[PDB]
Enzyme design. Structure first.
Site, PDB file in Angstrom:
ATOM      1  N   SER A 109     -16.050 -36.704  14.051  1.00 29.74           N
ATOM      2  CA  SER A 109     -16.219 -38.485  14.412  1.00 29.74           C
ATOM      3  C   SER A 109     -16.056 -38.858  15.754  1.00 29.74           C
ATOM      4  O   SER A 109     -15.943 -38.248  16.815  1.00 29.74           O
ATOM      5  CB  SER A 109     -16.036 -39.155  13.782  1.00 29.74           C
ATOM      6  OG  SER A 109     -17.062 -40.450  13.026  1.00 29.74           O
ATOM      7  N   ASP A 154     -26.397 -35.101   8.932  1.00 29.46           N
ATOM      8  CA  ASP A 154     -25.306 -36.400   8.510  1.00 29.46           C
ATOM      9  C   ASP A 154     -26.103 -37.706   8.732  1.00 29.46           C
ATOM     10  O   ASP A 154     -27.164 -37.884   9.942  1.00 29.46           O
ATOM     11  CB  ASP A 154     -24.730 -36.268  10.278  1.00 29.46           C
ATOM     12  CG  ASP A 154     -23.065 -37.105  10.384  1.00 29.46           C
ATOM     13  OD1 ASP A 154     -22.720 -36.596  10.750  1.00 29.46           O
ATOM     14  OD2 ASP A 154     -23.503 -37.748  10.362  1.00 29.46           O
ATOM     15  N   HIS A 159     -21.478 -36.713   6.930  1.00 30.41           N
ATOM     16  CA  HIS A 159     -20.670 -37.194   7.196  1.00 30.41           C
ATOM     17  C   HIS A 159     -19.080 -37.166   7.207  1.00 30.41           C
ATOM     18  O   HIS A 159     -18.479 -36.189   7.578  1.00 30.41           O
ATOM     19  CB  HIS A 159     -21.073 -38.216   7.912  1.00 30.41           C
ATOM     20  CG  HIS A 159     -19.825 -38.718   9.263  1.00 30.41           C
ATOM     21  ND1 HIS A 159     -20.038 -37.971  10.535  1.00 30.41           N
ATOM     22  CD2 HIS A 159     -18.954 -39.302   9.297  1.00 30.41           C
ATOM     23  CE1 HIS A 159     -19.356 -38.148  11.868  1.00 30.41           C
ATOM     24  NE2 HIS A 159     -18.503 -38.971  10.792  1.00 30.41           N
TER      25      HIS A 159
END
Length: 431
Positions: A174, A324, A356
């Site tokens: 991330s 995502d 995600h």
């Protein structure tokens, strides 16, 4: 926590003679108690060290290091990049790692983070995790993050008197994957003596502009605003330009997201559905100077970049949820395709059925197996960039095999628990 708030602490300040220090040179250090250190019988220290900011100025920063009880040999170093995702000083990874329960960004240090760092310590690796946003909390400033990280690795080698060719690997997800990809990109030019044998990152924001347009106006628009804030904290002429254009709301909001104690949880909760353009009196901001040209430097996607982007040649594992819903998939697929056409060695793992938070777990065992293989010189030969979902037990050994039962049981415990982002983790393998 075990130490004062970083705002209250001169350990988090840059001394006036900073320029007399070399890059990565340890200014001061202190023993610190950390949850991870206590859980793994590994001494932890914070290192105050010299690094370099976006304006190419010598600055200090802080990093946290853990010394394994039984070091592997020759010495191997594992750099873990946290998803800080905030623009306040006390959201720093160093502060979040300490024993204590009141740190506002504590969430980013618990959950998957201790599994990963714990695992690396059980392999006998030295672990470093730098405060990659630096003392301005410049979230998403890639040159800022890349230099701080490479210099943190340098500082661990200085601090522990490790050999110069000590093997290095890097890992993050991330916001930590943005930091990771930037540190790999700058290695060649900024820190070429670091013997990097591997790197592993997922859910990667590769283009600041693209991640912005994907996020603005949605449920995680607070991350768009955080990126604007973080970039302005690394680029003073973008900061002036923006300051001049903030309406009264924009002024209240920018101050807020920079306020002490406003970390990732508050970023997530305070700003769903915000349109960052509502904060200014200029809808065409993306297209004006100095912003437009900063966006062309703050990208590793060569089609977008106004400079020649590095192509690291060492083995890499890169994963992403195709669906995502927080960090867009295609820009990352574009980065892999480009890098592969210039001789990179990327094992690419796009997950076709994932989001995600679930891809955060799915890629974790493949990620650590990959890093172990990179340290051992045994990464498999693959056609660069071939989209293959990496599944534990299918394309890698089982979770228990890679992590050991203890750590794999900890990883199974995350399933259905809330992440920092307010969405639950899922299982180790896609259903």
């Amino acid at each position: 926590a075990a130490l004062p708030n970083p705002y209250d602490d001169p350990f988090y300040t840059t001394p006036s003679n900073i320029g007399t220090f070399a890059k990565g040179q340890v200014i001061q250090s202190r023993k610190v108690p950390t949850d991870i250190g206590n859980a793994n019988n590994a001494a932890s220290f914070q290192l105050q060290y010299r690094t370099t900011n976006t304006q190419n100025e010598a600055v200090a920063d802080v990093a946290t290091v853990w010394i394994p009880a039984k070091p592997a040999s020759p010495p191997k170093i594992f750099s873990y990049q946290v998803y800080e995702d905030a623009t306040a000083l006390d959201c720093a990874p160093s502060y979040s790692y300490l024993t204590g329960l009141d740190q506002p960004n504590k969430v980013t240090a618990v959950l998957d983070t201790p599994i990963i760092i714990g695992w690396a310590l059980q392999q006998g690796y030295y672990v470093v995790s730098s405060d990659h946003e630096g003392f301005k909390a410049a979230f998403i400033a890639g040159y800022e993050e890349g230099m701080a990280i490479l210099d943190g690795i340098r500082a661990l080698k200085n601090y522990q008197n490790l050999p110069s060719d000590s093997k290095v690997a890097l890992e993050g997800y991330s916001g930590g994957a943005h930091a990771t990809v930037w540190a790999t990109s700058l290695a060649e030019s900024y820190a070429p003596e670091l013997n990097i044998v591997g790197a592993s990152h997922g859910g990667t924001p590769v283009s600041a502009k693209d991640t912005f347009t994907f996020l603005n106006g949605g449920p995680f628009a607070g991350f768009a605003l955080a990126g604007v804030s973080g970039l302005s904290l690394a680029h003073p002429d973008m900061e002036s330009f923006i300051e001049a254009r903030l309406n009264a709301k924009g002024q209240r909001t920018l101050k807020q997201i920079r306020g002490r104690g406003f970390c990732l949880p508050q970023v997530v909760l305070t700003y769903p559905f915000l349109n960052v353009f509502s904060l200014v009196n200029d809808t065409n901001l993306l297209n004006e100077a100095p912003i437009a040209s900063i966006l062309k430097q703050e990208t590793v996607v060569q089609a977008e970049a106004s400079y020649t982007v590095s192509v690291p040649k060492f083995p890499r594992f890169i994963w992403h949820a195709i669906p995502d819903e927080i960090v867009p998939y295609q820009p990352a697929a574009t980065y892999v395709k480009e890098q592969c056409a210039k001789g990179a060695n990327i094992n690419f793992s796009p997950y076709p059925i994932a989001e995600h938070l679930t891809a955060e777990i799915f890629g974790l065992v493949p990620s650590l197996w990959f890093i172990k293989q990179a340290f051992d010189g045994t990464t498999p030969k693959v056609i660069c960039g071939t989209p293959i979902p990496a599944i534990a037990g299918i394309t890698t050994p089982s979770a228990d095999q890679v992590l050991g039962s203890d750590l794999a049981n900890q990883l199974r415990s995350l399933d259905g628990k809330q992440s920092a982002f307010g969405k639950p983790f899922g299982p180790i393998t896609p259903p």
